[PDB]
Symmetry: D3
Subunit: 245 residues, 6 copies
């Protein structure tokens, strides 16, 4: 059995039904090495795939690249190969002043500012994580000693206008996203990232278990553009450990 993009087979996964899915291909090996016997499987495009053992159980680590589209491909093809549980880890920008750099966020629900989520469920469907994964992620994050926030994540198909950044080439933002950061802020939204809406909606509507944990590397009340990453991947691995049956 083969897949179009990931360059791996079901056999390469060694019966793994859980995958950790960072965005950056270069973080895949780093995640894999936190577990036992990390093995490089394949590397094509933004998709770097590693396999490792966690408490004697096979775990896949597969980068998604940036954004819902490349993420949806990874999730689908991993699903075709037996993966049922997806643990998202990444960096994020906080929009609440009380959420500090270094804090960890576990997404209880995503504002669907993406297009890919709509390819699995209409907008009315909630971009919500599997409750067990969100629970495992909260537990792993809190046990690590990190400061953890459970709440809503604004998930944008763009890094710049969709997160209302103005230090850009045009220096402007389409009507929809003008004043949007303050809007999300007033609505209690914790942070911005770019994959959770797609991942959560796709999985919640496909019989797949998913959750998102993110390390805050910037607070948007302070500035627009930028370890926390190291602690984040330790957390997602322990979250994976908690998810293992």
């Amino acid at each position: 059995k083969t897949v179009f993009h990931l360059g791996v087979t079901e056999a390469d996964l060694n019966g793994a039904t859980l995958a950790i899915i960072p965005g950056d291909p270069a973080r895949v090996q780093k995640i894999a090495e936190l577990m036992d016997n990390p093995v490089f499987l394949a590397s094509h495009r933004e998709y770097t795939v590693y396999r490792a053992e966690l408490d004697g159980q096979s775990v896949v680590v597969c980068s998604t690249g940036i954004g819902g589209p490349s993420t949806s491909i990874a999730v689908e093809e991993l699903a075709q190969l037996g993966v049922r549980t997806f643990l998202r880890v990444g960096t994020t920008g906080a929009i609440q002043p009380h959420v500090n750099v270094g804090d960890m966020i576990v997404t209880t629900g995503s504002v669907r500012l993406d297009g890919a989520s709509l390819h699995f469920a209409p907008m009315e469907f909630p971009a919500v994580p599997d409750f067990d994964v969100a629970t495992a992620m909260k537990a792993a994050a809190q046990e690590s000693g990190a400061t953890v926030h459970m709440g809503v994540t604004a998930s944008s198909d763009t890094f710049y206008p969709g997160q209302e950044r103005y230090d850009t080439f045009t220096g402007r933002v389409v009507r929809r996203f003008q004043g949007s950061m303050k809007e999300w802020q007033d609505m209690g939204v914790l942070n911005f990232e770019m994959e959770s809406a797609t991942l959560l909606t796709m999985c919640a509507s496909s019989g797949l278990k998913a959750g998102c944990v993110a390390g805050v590397i910037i607070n948007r009340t302070q500035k627009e553009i930028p370890e926390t990453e190291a602690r984040s991947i330790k957390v997602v691995v322990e979250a994976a450990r908690k998810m293992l049956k």
Copy 2:
């Protein structure tokens, strides 16, 4: 002091920051009596308000009536009077064949088939419960010996076409909702009700903590038209409230 609809003042609530919000006004006293010193506060329209004490702390029980609109009023006016945590309990129709009558469902997210939620946040915003409330509801429901399901709830502004019932006056359902139950079913949606989308969206976007627990009284794979489930449901929401009390 005094809110437009609920007919109660902040002083009436005795410092209560948590509310249990059933739909049926007749359920209010039944919930209240499970706690200490229940007292009738006011009854206006579909809004019946009791105050009670749970482990020393004041707790409000307030009916919402059916639907997001009447619910949004209760939640807002209770919020004006200092309530920050809202525990929804009610009945629901399951759409998954493995979810049985008597089971309980704690909503982890609502399909927003309502209009009121849009008055607090755009459709992209997730109709999501507070995690502590959802966690407390699961624990409470499990401890009661009930079979508990965590998952997505379809929350409809109508009981009939929005939940794709056909045994109706017209026997007709608008295009949007034709085949919708099968669609939600394939998407793993657990059940139908009418208040969660509004409640969850409103609270999640207003700095209020909310969650929903529901006793399944009908499985929609079996039929369209629906008491031990009733009694167990309110005991759970009270225990969930106890877990939430700080």
Copy 3:
């Protein structure tokens, strides 16, 4: 035989094909007693059901509760039991300075700021009353001697942000409804209520005859506070009108 929510049967209605549908269950008896032989049928949730006779014909009075969702249930279940005509009565807040407290509004069309209407017809479908019912309601309202306004009603799924109220817990109104009050006022919208859009859309698309008449009890463009005698009279006149409107609808 017995509808799930209203807890009544077709026999309970005594052949009634017309329902008067106030929002407040406590108003149901008051309306019923304006007619002959008022009889309490059932009371469940926000649904209080009476039956009465008007010119020898059975009329149902059934409360809807607040909002389109609970309203849609009452209308549907009454329709299952043979009711074909629905007369909405209540009180409302005017948003036009020329519309005074005590005046009455007959809705010719509703701004669909609700969600339940979408469960019967897509947004492009007009939330309009049956022409005969609107005609009857206008006639009854004018014959009562009150000043009557025929126009568009903003029908909101919320009492607060959807009607751009800022005196709230958050004090915040979502982008969609920011400045919406001014917008509706400029478009000539007469008033805000919370059931008409659902009711009118549901009925106009389901072969049911419906209309809405309301007594103006407050005006948000006027800082003046109406006296208790005016509010009481308005409340009484509104239900007097809807019963006379029913009388005109009877065949």
Copy 4:
């Protein structure tokens, strides 16, 4: 003062506050001559404008052309020149089997299957006629001896796919409109035309009185090719009705 398209001035209208607005420029003179002292004012593009007198009061007749866009231009520019009341008359195709060819329809609300209405009010706003105009049209229609239907009109930006016609170049209808006629039929929609949604929405949200009356030229459940003598009689009656409706509005 001058306008951009109609080529008429306020002085040309001689104080007219009411306009009868047919779709076909050829129909303008036919309407005008039913009144006193018809005078050709201008003819630019689809806009043929006549002035006439009805019971001593100036009345403007102005064609709209086909569709909301050209209609919205006419209504706006007439409004700039002092016109406050607009009486739409036009041909239509019925979609209900109980509505016969030769019957008349007065629109109580329009299904907004257009785009121009959205330029005046969001979709939730009802495409509703002024109640006096609808009432005047119903009376004038009934008094002409015609069988009159009050109800919802589906108002489409296209003649073909938006009215679900398949006998076309591509024979294709976009997903949105596939099975739409059946849907409108089930929702009790009476007929198709192409201007009412824009007209009613624009006017209802701009402080203008508007209404639509139409002669049924074809029934979509029957045949597309109308019989000549029947068509002629219907069209003659429709313009007589709208003039009488204008008379009722001016009184």
Copy 5:
């Protein structure tokens, strides 16, 4: 054999597979006379139809009237009569300060501020001209010595609020279009007209080749009242360009 509105037959067209479609009925003759053996075919409503010969090949010239609805009818019925290629020429108002009065615009894509386009394809579908037609139009326009702009055209279902004109009867513009002018300007949109969105979307989704070329009559950042000689020269240049564009499209 017979079309519903145009009043012409396939035989009338003499094997013409290309149509030049101006908006103004009066422009049809002007365009036809730029070609050989111009022949008046029919004139009904907005639809003035002429036939002519360009390099020995039949070309039909047909007015569309204002707006997508009347345009969609013309295109469809011409298509039924064998037309496969549609060349749009029309007047436009530019919104970019660098686009001068008298310049020419060839639409590379249209902002779909209309409703009729939605009757052929969902909003996500690009309102895009056929590449050959756009190429031919650009070449014709540039060869004429005109200053030519390739870019996006905002295509509105209204002349007034949809193009954010405030000098109107109400002086009001619905929320959607408030500040929309500035928005389109910042997005590099070149001009406003009222037919391209419908035309381009309809044709690109129906196997029909279409394109739009327009003479800039006014600039919205300047004045609304065009100078007569400048306008005349621009309009004359535009029709010469579209005919030469038609010549390039001839196979």
Copy 6:
């Protein structure tokens, strides 16, 4: 002076380049760069591999976009901040018209916006349209390579599977919106599916940037035959040859 956050390059790194060639695959970046003079690796972060090269004495950037509008929008934006004004998109595609063969080339004249990122630059009404000069240069270059070239509409999806109505998936389910969508696009004359054009074109057309998309057809959803290996390899090489030629035409 600044180094853009994702691409990890500076304005000085680009050597005055105002045109960028933007493939999807990072591995293809060097392959494109070496078709020009003095290719130099600039940076590789995430799915973004950036090379600089020279075409007729003028600096040109080659930068991968990764898969999808979101990652593409980042690349385009940050290159734009560093002075890039013209973006030439090249990539593989799946044709959905029986008259389009594997090995043929498609130049997008407009994109069906089945994405989300495009909405972050312009409302849905706005056309996902290429710059006319870029589309013209791409057509000419494609023709000059001897390829069969198709000018037309491209469906640009945020997903490879349900948004392109693939049913051979984990769920085998396709959401209501996209059920029967393939046939709909086909009947509407849509030529192919890819996953970046709507975002790219909408973003650039509304931001004063020039952009165009050219694509090598590597598969046809209507043809049951398996694409020949030799044709596929030729198509890969031809597509990047064409885009460099298109760049040359755009430069001068």
